[PDB]
Structure 1
Amino acid sequence: XXXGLNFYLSYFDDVAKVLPREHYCFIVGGWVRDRILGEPVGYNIDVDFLTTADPVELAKNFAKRIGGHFFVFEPTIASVVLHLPPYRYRFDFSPLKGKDLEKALIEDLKERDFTANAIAVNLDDVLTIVYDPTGGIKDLEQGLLRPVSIENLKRDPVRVLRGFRIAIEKNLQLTEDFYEFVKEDPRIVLKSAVERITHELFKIMKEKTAHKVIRELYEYGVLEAIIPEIGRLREVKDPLDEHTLKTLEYLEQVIEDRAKYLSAELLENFGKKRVLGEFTDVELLKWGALFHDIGKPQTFAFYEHDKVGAQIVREIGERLRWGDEATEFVAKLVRHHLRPFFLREAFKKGELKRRGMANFWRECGDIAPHLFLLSIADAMASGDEEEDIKALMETIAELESFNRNEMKXXXXXXXXXXXXXXXXXXXXXXXXXXXXXXX
């Protein structure tokens, strides 16, 4: 332990007004962390507490006070979730028990993954003596995220990704012992539950420096052990894997710059699609950039490798428990991923016509901007000539402007609607349709 507006939160008062006299409560986890790091409070607040009283009644009355929902789940801990559009509050209360309070505190802290997460403070001193037996402060000053002990990483293998994510997110450098431990057994990641790996994988794709972490998870073979399919890109010598990596990185450089490639109506709904509740479609675009060609080593002489791509992606989505909607998204993104290049190649000959455009926007109108961005970043990774790229953005311009404006007996009904739609581009018309269909 080393030496209120610095560690204040509005709701803390409420907790103290719930928490009984005899029992004591400590604030642990990422709150004290992010605060020490001096990063400002976001729109999503997550606070983990350690209390000596019954966390369930605590959480029930707390939630009753702030008008939050109540939660109990597996030790056995209690949650309170209060969610309105601008902000989200997750409070997780955890039990603490012992004949010696300080001893048990230190004993809990020491079991934690990283010194940056083991720093804790007493509730009373919030409303400035801190508890950091791992000495998290010292590392946080050096700007280094260092695991407490390797045994606690091995305990819950999924933490091995956290160490990457956190270090990228909070922008810190992992220590040597972490990277050494990953070099030892990169396969350990498979021992942890699947949806955790998925969820962490997405939490890494979320940020815009993600290409460096994905390269990292590749280079230690962790991204291989999770998804062996990525390991198979190297079995074909053009380099395919480096290609997918730089395509990813360029997809981030383009996505940040997205306003100046795509139109406004194409940016309108972009980013607005939700999957797994905290993640948008941008991460799906980054995934479909990683898998953009997953099928090339499967089929070569690469004729079918796009559909093969779709099938492999889909298998990865089923396996890793992604959304069926999201995995279908990524799979369709890898399926049509080569479409704008054929449209550009058709445009360079001036052979692109209303048919190709109408097909384009009927077949896939929703993945269009993602498809365009991905095609532009893949063109930038392939190192296309400037003229070729200019032609590409011009093609995109053509399609965009086409959609912009120029786009505004069971069998019998089907052909009736189809021919009515062809005519829109009258009982006598219906009778004539019937005569044309019957004859």
Structure 2
Amino acid sequence: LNFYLSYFDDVAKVLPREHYCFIVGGWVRDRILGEPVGYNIDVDFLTTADPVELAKNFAKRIGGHFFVFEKRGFLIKRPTIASVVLHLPPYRYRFDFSPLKGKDLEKALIEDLKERDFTANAIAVNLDDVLSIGAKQTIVYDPTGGIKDLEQGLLRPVSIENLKRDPVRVLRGFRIAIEKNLQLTEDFYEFVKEDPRIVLKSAVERITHELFKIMKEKTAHKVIRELYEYGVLEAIIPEIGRLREVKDPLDEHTLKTLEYLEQVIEDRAKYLSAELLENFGKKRVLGEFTDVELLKWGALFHDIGKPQTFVTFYEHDKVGAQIVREIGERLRWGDEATEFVAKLVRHHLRPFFLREAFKKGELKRRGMANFWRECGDIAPHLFLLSIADAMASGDEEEDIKALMETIAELESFNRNEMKEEXXXXXXXXXXXXXXXXXXXXXXXXXXXXXXXXXX
């Protein structure tokens, strides 16, 4: 009843008569927790069938085109997982399929469950048991006793060795703990305390994926703070640790910048214009993530250049862009993604300048047009980041209002004031280049002043 999903039926139709499937990990966990199903559904499976064929035909039934990547060999037993990803804008589906092999089915299932990272993820149920019609409580498999830990609200790794085998999970342990609101056990925290840099063992792609999963949630700032306190964030991103040596506290300012940024993004309807809000957050990166996570990375990286420069900081913020680019290359971020974050960091101080020009009444069509021309793409993100950084810097409420009103002045100037009205009038790319220069003069006796300014 609780464990039911519609597509499971399709699985049962694809699943061979002599082969079985088991619902494992996150889905059963969240289902026991009694959490309402979100817009993202991820279900892990353990099957005795061929995962490739099973997931391929399931993918033929529901769409969600077939995904199989792993190496095959005589041994060591090399896992092959086949996933189905069905993506429509409001809802995303991911079904994982993993091989289950052995002479004793139950012993093999238990054996596989004991290898998993945490007790909450070690709970597995049988597919045929979920589809079972009545007169029984569907049997659950938790040799690690995940249910008991979930009842006590504790997130306990099965064994520390499992964490040392796959270090990236040490990130999950934090994230889930904040995401499902669970308290991690003592042995975990102690293990992280002993050797924080262990996370560097696992592949970089999975690290990036996990960190993006962290940046996805609205509680992200807490998890980031937790990763920074244990030195994990410094191990993954050495540049963040360098924010430590420059004293005004820059690191606290950055964490608070993120924490405030989340609240601002929640309030984004207030400050931002509707035309900006329409296309905001709808830009996909890495196939499961949006530009919002890039905005949060833009909050963490908002000043990464202040430690590099030293009385005042001047040219760093551009340097911030370069550093962000380097990290993006090292962390295997998407090209357009790391370019977006870099561009977001580069201009991070721009709305403050326009604000200062607004408070003095110096802000005019020239500065606005220059702004929107230079960056119109990162404009909303830059606005939210500017407001957040204004909240984190302890700016006066009047000054913050000046920033918001400056932002909305830019937006109002763009949505309505800015209109191109041509080549036939100028003659009354040599003509196109002079048309762009005359356009900048209109965005900042009339015809003669434009013809003279062009030559």
TM over 0.5: same fold? yes
In the superposition, relative to structure 1, how do residues 355 and 45 fare at CA in structure 2: closer, same or farther (>3 Å)?
A: same
In the superposition, relative to structure 1, how do residues 394 and 167 fare at CA in structure 2: closer, same or farther (>3 Å)?
A: same
Residue 407 of structure 1 and its aligned partner are, at CA, apart by 0.4
**Alpha-carbon distance in structure 2 between the residues aligned to 1:187 and 1:94:** 29
**Alpha-carbon distance in structure 2 between the residues aligned to 1:294 and 1:83:** 35
Residue 133 of structure 1 and its aligned partner are, at CA, apart by 0.4
TM-score, normalised relative to structure 2? 0.85
**Alpha-carbon distance in structure 1 between the residues aligned to 2:83 and 2:58:** 10
Residue 85 of structure 1 and its aligned partner are, at CA, apart by 4.4
Q: What's 1:322 paired with?
A: 333
**What SS class does the counterpart of residue 91 from structure 1 fall into?**
strand
**The one of 54, 57, 64 aligned to 2:53:** 57
In the superposition, relative to structure 1, how do residues 129 and 306 fare at CA in structure 2: closer, same or farther (>3 Å)?
A: same
Q: What's 2:164 paired with?
A: 154
Residue 86 of structure 1 and its aligned partner are, at CA, apart by 4.3
Q: Which moved more, 1:284-293 or 1:399-408?
A: 399-408
**What SS class does the counterpart of residue 80 from structure 1 fall into?**
strand
Residue 68 of structure 1 and its aligned partner are, at CA, apart by 4.8
Deviations 1:14-66, CA, capped at 9 Å, x for gaps: 33333334333322121211111112233332222222233333334433444
Instruction: Report the aligned-residue RMSD.
Output: 1.7
In the superposition, relative to structure 1, how do residues 94 and 240 fare at CA in structure 2: closer, same or farther (>3 Å)?
A: same
Residue 404 of structure 1 and its aligned partner are, at CA, apart by 2.2
Residue 375 of structure 1 and its aligned partner are, at CA, apart by 1.2
Residue 400 of structure 1 and its aligned partner are, at CA, apart by 1.9
**Alpha-carbon distance in structure 1 between the residues aligned to 2:293 and 2:10:** 37
Residue 267 of structure 1 and its aligned partner are, at CA, apart by 2.1
**The one of 15, 20, 29 aligned to 2:16:** 20
In the superposition, relative to structure 1, how do residues 240 and 166 fare at CA in structure 2: closer, same or farther (>3 Å)?
A: same
**What SS class does the counterpart of residue 99 from structure 1 fall into?**
coil
**Alpha-carbon distance in structure 2 between the residues aligned to 1:82 and 1:390:** 44
Q: What's 1:437 paired with?
A: none
Q: What's 1:87 paired with?
A: 91
**What SS class does the counterpart of residue 147 from structure 1 fall into?**
coil
Residue 344 of structure 1 and its aligned partner are, at CA, apart by 1.3
**Alpha-carbon distance in structure 1 between the residues aligned to 2:15 and 2:409:** 64
In the superposition, relative to structure 1, how do residues 373 and 70 fare at CA in structure 2: closer, same or farther (>3 Å)?
A: closer
**Alpha-carbon distance in structure 2 between the residues aligned to 1:83 and 1:266:** 24
Deviations 1:317-375, CA, capped at 9 Å, x for gaps: 11101111111111111111111111111222222222111111111112112111111
In the superposition, relative to structure 1, how do residues 281 and 228 fare at CA in structure 2: closer, same or farther (>3 Å)?
A: same
Deviations 1:368-395, CA, capped at 9 Å, x for gaps: 1211111111111111122222222222
TM-score, normalised relative to structure 1? 0.88
Deviations 1:128-187, CA, capped at 9 Å, x for gaps: 221110000011111221100000000011011111122222222211211111111110
Residue 84 of structure 1 and its aligned partner are, at CA, apart by 4.1
In the superposition, relative to structure 1, how do residues 60 and 263 fare at CA in structure 2: closer, same or farther (>3 Å)?
A: closer
Q: What's 1:274 paired with?
A: 284
In the superposition, relative to structure 1, how do residues 370 and 68 fare at CA in structure 2: closer, same or farther (>3 Å)?
A: closer
Residue 73 of structure 1 and its aligned partner are, at CA, apart by 2.2
**Alpha-carbon distance in structure 1 between the residues aligned to 2:397 and 2:53:** 66
In the superposition, relative to structure 1, how do residues 243 and 12 fare at CA in structure 2: closer, same or farther (>3 Å)?
A: same
Residue 305 of structure 1 and its aligned partner are, at CA, apart by 1.2
**Alpha-carbon distance in structure 2 between the residues aligned to 1:9 and 1:399:** 48
Where do 5+ consecutive residues of structure 2 fail to align? 71-78, 132-137, 420-455
Where do 5+ consecutive residues of structure 1 fail to align? 409-439
**Alpha-carbon distance in structure 1 between the residues aligned to 2:251 and 2:110:** 45
Q: What's 2:316 paired with?
A: 305
Alignment of 1:304-383 (within 5 A): 304-383=315-394
In the superposition, relative to structure 1, how do residues 232 and 32 fare at CA in structure 2: closer, same or farther (>3 Å)?
A: same
Q: Which moved more, 1:255-264 or 1:14-23?
A: 14-23
In the superposition, relative to structure 1, how do residues 9 and 305 fare at CA in structure 2: closer, same or farther (>3 Å)?
A: same
**What SS class does the counterpart of residue 121 from structure 2 fall into?**
coil
**The one of 133, 142, 148 aligned to 2:143:** 133
Q: What's 1:72 paired with?
A: 68
Residue 227 of structure 1 and its aligned partner are, at CA, apart by 0.5
Q: Which moved more, 1:95-104 or 1:393-402?
A: 393-402
Q: Does 1:111 align with 2:121?
A: no
**Alpha-carbon distance in structure 1 between the residues aligned to 2:267 and 2:111:** 48
In the superposition, relative to structure 1, how do residues 277 and 62 fare at CA in structure 2: closer, same or farther (>3 Å)?
A: closer
**Alpha-carbon distance in structure 2 between the residues aligned to 1:380 and 1:59:** 49
Residue 255 of structure 1 and its aligned partner are, at CA, apart by 1.0
In the superposition, relative to structure 1, how do residues 369 and 61 fare at CA in structure 2: closer, same or farther (>3 Å)?
A: closer
Deviations 1:183-220, CA, capped at 9 Å, x for gaps: 11110111111111111111111111111111110000
**Alpha-carbon distance in structure 2 between the residues aligned to 1:283 and 1:23:** 41
In the superposition, relative to structure 1, how do residues 81 and 382 fare at CA in structure 2: closer, same or farther (>3 Å)?
A: closer
Residue 114 of structure 1 and its aligned partner are, at CA, apart by 0.3
In the superposition, relative to structure 1, how do residues 134 and 254 fare at CA in structure 2: closer, same or farther (>3 Å)?
A: same
In the superposition, relative to structure 1, how do residues 402 and 58 fare at CA in structure 2: closer, same or farther (>3 Å)?
A: closer
Residue 71 of structure 1 and its aligned partner are, at CA, apart by 3.0
Q: Which moved more, 1:335-344 or 1:349-358?
A: 349-358
Residue 401 of structure 1 and its aligned partner are, at CA, apart by 1.9
Q: How many residues align?
A: 404
**Alpha-carbon distance in structure 2 between the residues aligned to 1:251 and 1:322:** 22
**Alpha-carbon distance in structure 1 between the residues aligned to 2:12 and 2:288:** 30
In the superposition, relative to structure 1, how do residues 344 and 162 fare at CA in structure 2: closer, same or farther (>3 Å)?
A: same
In the superposition, relative to structure 1, how do residues 181 and 284 fare at CA in structure 2: closer, same or farther (>3 Å)?
A: same
Identity %: 100
In the superposition, relative to structure 1, how do residues 376 and 81 fare at CA in structure 2: closer, same or farther (>3 Å)?
A: closer
**Alpha-carbon distance in structure 1 between the residues aligned to 2:396 and 2:90:** 45
In the superposition, relative to structure 1, how do residues 345 and 111 fare at CA in structure 2: closer, same or farther (>3 Å)?
A: same
**What SS class does the counterpart of residue 303 from structure 1 fall into?**
coil
In the superposition, relative to structure 1, how do residues 43 and 254 fare at CA in structure 2: closer, same or farther (>3 Å)?
A: closer
Q: Does 1:203 align with 2:207?
A: no
In the superposition, relative to structure 1, how do residues 303 and 202 fare at CA in structure 2: closer, same or farther (>3 Å)?
A: same
In the superposition, relative to structure 1, how do residues 80 and 370 fare at CA in structure 2: closer, same or farther (>3 Å)?
A: closer
In the superposition, relative to structure 1, how do residues 88 and 399 fare at CA in structure 2: closer, same or farther (>3 Å)?
A: closer
In the superposition, relative to structure 1, how do residues 389 and 208 fare at CA in structure 2: closer, same or farther (>3 Å)?
A: same
**Alpha-carbon distance in structure 2 between the residues aligned to 1:52 and 1:279:** 32
In the superposition, relative to structure 1, how do residues 164 and 266 fare at CA in structure 2: closer, same or farther (>3 Å)?
A: same
